[PDB]
From Swiss-Prot, chain B:
It holds the Pfam family DNA_pol3_beta. One of its GO terms (molecular function) is identical protein binding. Confers DNA tethering and processivity to DNA polymerases and other proteins. Acts as a clamp, forming a ring around DNA (a reaction catalyzed by the clamp-loading complex) which diffuses in an ATP-independent manner freely and bidirectionally along dsDNA. DNA bound in the ring is bent 22 degrees, in solution primed DNA is bound more tightly than dsDNA, suggesting the clamp binds both ss- and dsDNA. In a complex of DNA with this protein, alpha, epsilon and tau subunits however the DNA is only slightly bent. Required for DnaA inactivation. The RIDA complex (regulatory inactivation of DnaA), composed of ATP-DnaA, Hda and the DNA-loaded beta sliding clamp (this protein) rapidly hydrolyzes ATP-DnaA to ADP-DnaA in a DNA-dependent fashion, preventing reinitiation of DNA replication. DnaA inactivation is stimulated by DNA synthesis. Residues 237-356 are annotated as: 3. This is Beta sliding clamp. The temperature- and UV-sensitive allele dnaN159 does not grow at temperatures higher than 37 degrees Celsius. The global SOS response is chronically induced. The UV-sensitivity of dnaN159 is dependent upon Pol IV (dinB), it has an enhanced Pol V-dependent mutation rate (umuC, umuD), and is absolutely dependent on the polymerase activity of Pol I (polA) for viability. SUPFAM superfamilies: DNA clamp (SSF55979). CDD domains: beta_clamp. It comes from Escherichia coli (strain K12). The keyword Isomerase does not apply. NCBIfam families: dnan.
Length: 360, 356
């Protein structure tokens, strides 16, 4: 196995196949039919990056320490030529008067995911999948014993793809039309897989092809192919959590709302983070207090014409939402003091967020 | 106690000054000035803010982080009205209202009074230079406590910093244009951090006062005071190689990046690399327990005798990173002695690394 390649034709592929038993700490390298393939895996998911070889090359395959190899390539100067050749049990890397000899492990020992058949497929712009994931990712659970929440639901229905995330306390949903007729279907992508998928998306003109099997998901964009197992479990139904008829709409500028809440949060309970809202004609008042009896109060002009009411909620969750929206204006959809709140960009129903009420 | 001040005039001060009462800031309105004081009993920062609007005298103590976070949290151009009521300190701006808990000003600790013995003035940029040139070589948590801080030495008209952990050393000397006595104090690491943090970067000069057990720095409307560390700091003069007459010169960034690449295949714990010097060439090698190997060859300016020597590469990289320069000079003795490293264009800082 031998190849010579420009440094910058390796770095993005290396970035993608690297991670965030010891062979899982290596990258599989393969030279075949004019192409260098690099694969990383943690047994649950895998990334394959292909790079065209325009310079003389010789076929073969090995595995090499991922972090050391990446760091060597990155440490070489911009534009450097990197010549690689297998020499016994070692991989030799040379560029200029810099030389390196890395340990290998056999390509035969690099683990594969089981083979599987694709049952649902669709293509969509990368920007669209990026918006879907970014809209909801922050509401996924981390390491909950309810293992099926440590991930994101992907739901196809009609011509729409939808993502849902919840940690069992708060919920995020995003839906976007993708212009293809789809079966009604849903799967749970593990949280790490979501993150890896997200980082594969450069926001470019390459279309994204998604293929979903009964136990796996695959995403293809240009020179990259990502494959992950699905979480084998039942996701909760997002539909029963959405408020039925939130008939009291408050609208206000996102930043003003966010800044008022961030100030109020400073004097809220450090563990439970409850803040109270008092809504009246075109006016919102936010209060917070803590066990030390310190108190915050914010009054803002907003748009509102419903009946007066008050509601409490977790200010950390509400701030998470307002930071995810990054938009001009926000809509808070209210029912009463004992019902959840749904929050949206005032100018788009594509993403919605639900936060539980708190009795304070 | 009442004041009303622009957000812009509180923020920098609050940031500079930021057992329960140690978590609070002491606020004092007296003689048309707001004083803000923060302390951890070892050191203290005081900021003075002139009050151009109506105000009433008095003092209290309030949670530092919360007050800072509320003031920062308010919008550009906010006016911040403050008054003691209770028990509580009220902060108001726009239609944002806050009630904070207090501890009595009477309880706020004072550093003991002390007398200035040595005093001088120098530019902010010179103190920045002195500290950044050496800070990275201080020990962290060494049982020789005085190595966890930084020596500040006056000699002739020079102010000098020295930092060392036993394994490598940094020294930097700068002229300050005043006749100074010969004196040395050791400033604790925390104090060195704060001393740096108060510069700022404007053209306000720094005024330093040194006592037998304290150092004080005045810049602008801020006064920082720290206790000193006792103990006998080593003599940089005995650490400098007596006659390192083998002189190698190389590009700083070229040299750094070569070491940084070799370091990848050095032992993770011991970090050793080998240097082979010969006529106008440097070879750097490294290897690890997995028998992986790195080799770098660089063109350098060298016409001394050949030799080889081992070093902890993290120590060398620390030096090269702290030098912000075009070319470096490595000054060698033999395979079992230290190396001295300087900017090829300046002698005002020097670095010493022990061989492995
Ligand atoms: O080890 C010792 O007993 C003294 C005192 C601490 C600093 C230091 C010593 N000897 C040194 C030799 C070299 C360097 Cl870089 C620093 C030091
Ligand atoms: Ca992977
Ligand atoms: Ca449609
Ligand atoms: Ca294009
Ligand atoms: Ca209040
Ligand atoms: Ca070595
Ligand atoms: Cl004022
Ligand atoms: Cl010097």
């Amino acid at each position: 196995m031998k190849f010579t390649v420009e440094r910058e034709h390796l770095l993005k592929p290396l970035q993608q196949v690297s991670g965030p038993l010891p062979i899982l700490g290596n990258l599989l390298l393969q030279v075949a039919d004019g192409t260098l393939s690099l694969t990383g895996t943690d047994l649950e998911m895998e990334m394959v990056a292909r790079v065209a070889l325009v310079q003389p090359h010789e076929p073969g395959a090995t595995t090499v320490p991922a972090r050391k190899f990446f760091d060597i390539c990155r440490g070489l100067p911009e534009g450097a030529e990197i010549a690689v050749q297998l020499e016994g049990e070692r991989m030799l890397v040379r560029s200029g008067r810099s030389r390196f000899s890395l340990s290998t492990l056999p390509a035969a020992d690099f683990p594969n995911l089981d083979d599987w058949q694709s049952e649902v497929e669709f293509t969509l712009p990368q920007a669209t999948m990026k918006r879907l994931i970014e809209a909801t990712q922050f509401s996924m659970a981390h390491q909950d014993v309810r293992y099926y929440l440590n991930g994101m639901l992907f739901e196809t229905e009609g011509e729409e793809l939808r993502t849902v995330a919840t940690d069992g306390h708060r919920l995020a949903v995003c839906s976007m039309p993708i212009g293809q007729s789809l079966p009604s279907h849903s799967v749970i992508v593990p949280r790490k897989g979501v993150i890896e998928l997200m980082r594969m998306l450069d926001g470019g003109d390459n279309p994204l092809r998604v293929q979903i099997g009964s136990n796996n998901i695959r995403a293809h964009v240009g020179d990259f192919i990502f494959t992950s197992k699905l979480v084998d479990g039942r996701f909760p139904d997002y539909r029963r959590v959405l408020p039925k008829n939130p008939d009291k709409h408050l609208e206000a500028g996102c930043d003003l709302l966010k800044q008022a809440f961030a100030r109020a949060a400073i004097l809220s309970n450090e563990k439970f983070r409850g803040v109270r809202l008092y809504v009246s004609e075109n006016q919102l008042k936010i209060t917070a207090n803590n066990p030390e009896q310190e108190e915050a109060e914010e009054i803002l002009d907003v748009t509102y014409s419903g009946a007066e009411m008050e509601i409490g909620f977790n200010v950390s969750y509400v701030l998470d939402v307002l930071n995810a929206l990054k938009c001009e204006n926000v809509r808070m959809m209210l029912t009463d003091s004992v019902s959840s709140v749904q929050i949206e960009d005032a100018a788009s129903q594509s993403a919605a967020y639900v936060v539980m009420p708190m009795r304070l």
